[PDB]
Structures are given as C-alpha cells and as structure tokens.
Amino acid sequence: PIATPYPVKEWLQPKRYKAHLMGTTYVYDFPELFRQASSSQWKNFSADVKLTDDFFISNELIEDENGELTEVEREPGANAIGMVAFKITVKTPEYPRGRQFVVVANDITFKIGSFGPQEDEFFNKVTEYARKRGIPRIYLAANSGARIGMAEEIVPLFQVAWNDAANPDKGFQYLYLTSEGMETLKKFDKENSVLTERTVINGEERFVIKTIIGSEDGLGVECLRGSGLIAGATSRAYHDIFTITLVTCRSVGIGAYLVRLGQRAIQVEGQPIILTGAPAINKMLGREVYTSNLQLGGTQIMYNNGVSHLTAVDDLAGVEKIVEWMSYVPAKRNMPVPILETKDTWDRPVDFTPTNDETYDVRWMIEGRETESGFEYGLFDKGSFFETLSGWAKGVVVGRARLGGIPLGVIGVETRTVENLIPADPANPNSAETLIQEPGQVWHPNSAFKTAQAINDFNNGEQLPMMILANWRGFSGGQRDMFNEVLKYGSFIVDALVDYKQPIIIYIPPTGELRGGSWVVVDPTINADQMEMYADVNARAGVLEPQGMVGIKFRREKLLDTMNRLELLPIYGQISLQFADLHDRSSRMVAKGVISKELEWTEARRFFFWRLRRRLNEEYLIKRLSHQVGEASRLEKIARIRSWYPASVDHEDDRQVATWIEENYKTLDDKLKGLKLESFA
C-alpha cells in the first residue's frame, strides 16, 4: 500500500499482516492493548484523572547468555523463537503506585505458533520468573500445538529395496542408503541423522536404516516432552500465582491443555480450543463428519463447558476483561487483597429484597437492580459484580465483587429453572438435541462442580475472601444426577472449603433455605479456622422440608389425637406443616449454636463490611505470628493477639476491634517483632 498518512506498519513487519490474516492481534502489538485497557480502567474509575505515559511500562523479556530472563528494549519482530514475553508495570486504581505481571504469548507468525523445545523452555522459564516474584502470569494463546516434522535431509536420498524393480507395486522390504548417501551425510556431519546397519546384498553394500533421528531439532517426541514440561509448570503455577489465559486465536493440543491448566480462561469468539482438528478427525474417520473446528472448540462448546470462564468479542475485549479480573486480585502473592472504595459507601441499607411469591434474579440481591423509580442497591458495591463461568451450570451464579471496596468472591443460587439445551453429536446419526430442566435451589453434578471450581479459583492465585449466599434444598437424588456422579462433585465442595485460606462467610438469604445435603457440604465446622455461618431472620433450615417432617414424625395417628382441639384434614394438615416450619427458624439455629448470628437482610451490608474488615485485620495479625513463633495453635495465636486489645475494647465489636487495630499497626508490629526472643530450641 502506497501513500499512507504514517509509516506503514504491516510492511516494516509483514508478520503483522500475517497475524491479522490469521485473525489475531500481532503479538508485539498486545502490550498496547493492555495500555489501552489500563487507560479505560482509569476513565471508568475517575473520569477526571489525567494520565501520563509513564503510568504504563512494558519491557520485553528474553534470555541472556546464561539463559536468564532480562528486560531488553529491542525492536518488534526480532524474536528468535516463536514465543514472546513482556513484564508489565502499570499504575491502576487499586495500585496507584504500580503493580506488575508478565505476559507470555505464542507468536502465530513464527512457524504457525508451534510449540518447539525452545518455546517450551522459554515458556517454562517465564512461568518460573513470575512464580518466584509471585506476580500474575497472563498467557495469550495463538498456536498450532507441538511442532512436527521429518528428517528432510533423508528424503532426497533414501533408497527402497523392492521385491523386483520390474513390479515395484509388488511391495518392498526395507529402506536404505548407498555408500554414496552415507557420505553425503558425513559431509555435513549429519551422520547421527540415521541409525543404520551395513549389509552386503548380492548386489552392493546397502545400509539399512533402522531408525531415522533427524539432524534438526523439534520433530517429534522431544516436542511432546517440552509440552509436558509446561503442562506441569502451569499446573503448579495455578496454586502459586494468579493465572489467566486469553485464547486470542486457535489453541491446539498442549495449547488447549495450557488453557485449562491455568483454569481461568477468556475465549475470543470464533477462536477454537482444540485437541485434534476437524480435518484430521474427518480424515481418521473417513467420513466428512465435522465442518469447522468451532464445533469442537468454539465458545458454544467451551463456554457452555466451563473451560471458558468468559467470552470476548475481540482481543481488546478480552484484554479488558483480564485487566478487569485482576482488579480484585492482590498485586502479588500474599499481599493484602486490593481495596478500592467507590461512591457506594458501606453505610447504607440494602434496598432490593426477595419475596416468597415473586420470581427474582439473585443478581439483584448481589449488585442491585435498576427500576423505573430509581436504582435499588444490592448487598454489594454498585457495578462491582464481575460474573464468571456465566455460560456453564447456570444453577449457581459466581463472580467477584466489592463490599465497601473489599474485594471478595461471591456465590449465589439461581432460583429460576435453567433450560440446558445440549446439542446433538454430528458424529451420530441417532444423535438428537436435548433439553435438560435444571430446577432452582438444587445442586446438580454441574452446579456442584461449578461451586467447587469457583471456591478453588477464589482461593488459589486470587487469594480472596468469600461469601456464599447459601440457598439450596439439597442435591438432586434422582437417578440421572446420581448416575452422573453428583456425589463426587458435592465432595469436591467439601475438599475446596477445607483448603480455603481466607475468611469465609456463609449466609442463608431472606427467602432462602438450606436443607439436608446442602447444609452438610457447607457447614462451618468443615473449616473452623476460616468459616462463619449466618442465617437471615427470614431464612429456613432443617434436615428436611416441613412436608417431610410431618410425613415422618406427624403421622395420621398423631394428627388425630390433635383433632382434640376442635373433613377437616385440609386445615389440620396446615397446622402440622406450620408446626414443623416453626423448628426451622433462625432462632433455633442460634439457640442450638450452629450459626454465629441471625441477621436482617437490610442491615447485612453494614454488618458484613465490618465483620469482614475486622477479620481481614485479625488474619494479618495471625499470620505475622505464625511466621514468627512456630509452635502454637490458631486458638492460641488469636488469643495472644486479642489479649493485646485494650481492656475497654469489646472483642465482639467488629468496628471497634478493626478500628483499634488499624490505628496501631506499627505498635502491634513492634509487639510482634518483640516476640523474636521466642527462640525455643
């Protein structure tokens, strides 16, 4: 293209054009999308703030002589391998002074973004770089899978020993090389390119090739090993640092697994996440079964799956989502969660409230709802809800949110029935579309899976506190759900709670209820160190429902002796039912001591803001002790800590306790590093 306003980009670097033809942003152009999204981040936070370009820095990382990664300021497109990386330091609303993270990306223009040994070792190096520093690892996937190839240097000179040169079609018995070919190899030192055995046939000495190795690296198994390396590296990263992947273009094989192993994934529309491509599958099956890879790894598959937590219309959209996702995540492992107070102060009542006779969208209880007569504030900061895995197991709603600025994970129950429509298998003529009804307030294998998945993703990397607006009547005990292993996924929940390292809040909502199976799997005793449970005064909880209670311990026989109070069954049935429902009240929960407090929905936001803050504060103090004393149970540490509180401070006063602690961080700090003389040997 001639006569363009500015210096033609796709020409100074033709790769940029190739990247675009492929349908993805050019790898070296990504850092810019992060600057843009970071800018947009500030615009939404404070429309006024004036930004300087030094608010965002991106330094490429390449390996030096020692194989050590360093920040080099070189020109785009000069990458020797098909894998690039950048260390980004950017000031954000949560981290005004700056926060860092790394970005690793395949370079789709370099050998179709294949994964070769060199790319794998680079990928592994970078992942370790991030983990060491405890900073997030963002991965931009646009690849073709493990790199392949043959020993091309052996294709022009391989001879075949036939059954008779007269009729080649009669077959052969082995391939070989002539003493001439053997020399050709020896001339280029490409001798180890083949394992042979010299054997003199009546004709001449022919070297039978028993194995082809190849002089060039990255043809077969050496590539598979590299994949495993990064697979294991990523599995490890997920429990260490915040991990997220943007499928910016096709992602195949190891590329697909890398997406899942980092768990958190945002898939750009039309960018398939696949194992074996459609063409190759059709070939293998002989028939033309599939049309596009999108049938195998499109959003309609992976987003409905749960592999994709979110979808994006285009790369920039995805980058914005990543950046938005990180706003609730600590700057680096073990730092306090990033607090970001906004216009929505904590001191206000909760507007929206559910009704036992009015279908509602739990999201309204969460973020709030916009009505004709104004806006109804929910429990959390307005506009702070960031839902994820929204295309899978709609039975539960999971997302990040803020409570007076305090970021946290949130799990709500979808009350409306879900219409899960499963496509037909194009590989089966007998395959037919199927609609699955997913009853509200009930766990099914997929919603139990999504719950545990959410819990683990909140805990690992994100290191976030969490609140579950628990409201389930139990797990589906039907035969289908039971056959589909609902017991394994329910247990996954228990496992994930036991692993949680941040404060957890279980709260049964106003019109909510927690019954039998459901209560079990979320009870605070599962993790006494981090869990606390609260029942709204208008919530219900019992081993069974009122109906089941009368159906077992209020039989017709007992209903009769009751007739001695005044056919009439229609109303005496409602007397027993109500008799039972009177046991399932928060008051009994308090009386029996299974919950910490019965709360009032409208006053919840206020209460939880201070409880969470008071707890985050005591936790910080609890850890400082841990990494100082050594032998001492939690009970002991928290006691030694609360013993430092002024005599006049009411330990049960969340605000008071939180306020005092924040006013004495340094005094307490001395008190801590004063216990250094705790060298019990």
Task: List the interface residues with its own copies, window 586-645 (CB under 8 A).
Answer: 587-589, 591-594
- Per the CB < 8 A criterion, the answer to whether 432 and 417 are in contact is no
Q: What 8-state DSSP symbol labels residue 169?
A: G
Q: How far is the CB of 481 from ligand RCP (least distance, A)?
A: 7
Is 146 flagged in the annotation as binding? yes
- Per the CB < 8 A criterion, the answer to whether 197 and 207 are in contact is yes
413 contacts ligand RCP (rule: CB under 6 A): no
141 contacts its own copies (rule: CB under 8 A): no
Gap between the Cα atoms of 353 and 360, Å rounded: 9
Q: Which does 90 bind (CB under 5 to 8 A by kind): its own copies, ligand RCP, none?
A: none
**Closer by beta carbon to ligand RCP, 543 or else 638:** 543
131 contacts its own copies (rule: CB under 8 A): no
Is 588 flagged in the annotation as binding? no
**Closer by beta carbon to ligand RCP, 232 or else 279:** 279
Closest CA to 512 of 491, 533, 531: 533
**Closer by beta carbon to ligand RCP, 77 or else 439:** 439
Instruction: Dump strand ranges (E) for 172-275.
Output: 172-178, 194-200, 205-212, 243-247, 251-252, 264-268, 273-274
Burial label for 76, CB within 10 Å (0-12, 13-18, 19+), is middle
Q: Which does 672 bind (CB under 5 to 8 A by kind): its own copies, ligand RCP, none?
A: none
Gap between the Cα atoms of 266 and 252, Å rounded: 15
What is the number of residues in the chain?
A: 681
38 contacts its own copies (rule: CB under 8 A): no
Gap between the Cα atoms of 81 and 89, Å rounded: 24
**Closer by beta carbon to its own copies, 68 or else 485:** 485
Closest CA to 463 of 504, 494, 495: 504
Is 553 flagged in the annotation as binding? yes
Within 13 A of 236's CA, how many CA atoms are on the CB side?
14
Among 9, 21, 72, 172, the residue binding its own copies under the rule CB under 8 A is 172
606 contacts ligand RCP (rule: CB under 6 A): no
What kind and span of H or E run contains 58?
strand 56-63
Q: Nearest 5°: phi and psi at 161?
A: -85, 105
Q: How far is the CB of 94 from ligand RCP (least distance, A)?
A: 40
Q: Which does 139 bind (CB under 5 to 8 A by kind): ligand RCP, its own copies, none?
A: none
What kind and span of H or E run contains 449?
helix 445-459
213 contacts its own copies (rule: CB under 8 A): yes
Q: How far is the CB of 428 from its own copies (least distance, A)?
A: 8
Q: How far is the CB of 452 from its own copies (least distance, A)?
A: 12
**Closer by beta carbon to ligand RCP, 270 or else 440:** 440
In b/e form, how buried is each residue of 273-296, taking b as 16+ CB within 10 angstroms? bbeebbeebeeeeeeeebeebbbb
Instruction: Dump strand ranges (E) for 213-263.
Output: 243-247, 251-252
Strands 251-252 and 205-212: unpaired
In 246-351, alpha helices (H): 254-261, 278-285, 294-297, 299-305, 315-326
Among 22, 57, 317, 494, the residue binding its own copies under the rule CB under 8 A is 494
Number of residues that bind ligand RCP (CB under 6 A): 20
224 contacts its own copies (rule: CB under 8 A): yes
42 contacts its own copies (rule: CB under 8 A): no
The count of other CB atoms within 10 Å of the CB of residue 126 is 25
**Closer by beta carbon to ligand RCP, 201 or else 280:** 280
Q: 569-581 and 546-553 helices cross at what angle (nearest 10)? A: 110
Q: Which does 442 bind (CB under 5 to 8 A by kind): its own copies, ligand RCP, none?
A: ligand RCP
Gap between the Cα atoms of 277 and 273, Å rounded: 10
- Per the CB < 8 A criterion, the answer to whether 177 and 168 are in contact is no
Q: How far is the CB of 256 from ligand RCP (least distance, A)?
A: 12
Gap between the Cα atoms of 580 and 258, Å rounded: 52
Q: Which does 88 bind (CB under 5 to 8 A by kind): its own copies, ligand RCP, none?
A: none
Name residues contacting ligand RCP, limited to 516-555 (CB under 6 A). Answer: 516, 544-545, 547-548, 551-552
Q: How far is the CB of 320 from its own copies (least distance, A)?
A: 25
**Closer by beta carbon to its own copies, 31 or else 395:** 395
Q: Which does 390 bind (CB under 5 to 8 A by kind): its own copies, ligand RCP, none?
A: none
Name residues contacting its own copies, limited to 327-356 (CB under 8 A). Answer: none
- Per the CB < 8 A criterion, the answer to whether 411 and 389 are in contact is no
Name residues contacting ligand RCP, limited to 271-330 (CB under 6 A). Answer: 276, 280-281, 283-284
Q: How far is the CB of 496 from its own copies (least distance, A)?
A: 9
Among 116, 136, 509, 516, the residue binding its own copies under the rule CB under 8 A is 516
| Residues near 140 by beta carbon (within 8 Å), at least 6 away in sequence | 27, 30, 103, 104, 105, 106, 245, 246, 248
Q: Which does 627 bind (CB under 5 to 8 A by kind): its own copies, ligand RCP, none?
A: none
Number of residues that bind its own copies (CB under 8 A): 140
**Closer by beta carbon to ligand RCP, 36 or else 417:** 417
Q: How far is the CB of 289 from ligand RCP (least distance, A)?
A: 8
542 contacts its own copies (rule: CB under 8 A): yes
Burial label for 645, CB within 10 Å (0-12, 13-18, 19+), is middle
Name residues contacting ligand RCP, limited to 463-522 (CB under 6 A). Answer: 473-474, 476-478, 515-516
Is 622 flagged in the annotation as binding? no
| Residues near 253 by beta carbon (within 8 Å), at least 6 away in sequence | 115, 145, 146, 227, 274, 275
Name residues contacting its own copies, limited to 569-588 (CB under 8 A). Answer: 570-572, 574-575, 578-580, 582-585, 587-588
Q: Nearest 5°: phi and psi at 170?
A: -75, -5
Is 147 flagged in the annotation as binding? yes
| Known binding-site positions | 146-148, 250, 517, 553, 555
Binding site for ligand RCP (CB under 6 A): 276, 280-281, 283-284, 439, 442, 473-474, 476-478, 515-516, 544-545, 547-548, 551-552
| Known binding-site positions for acetyl-CoA | 146-148, 517
| Known binding-site positions for CoA | 250, 553, 555
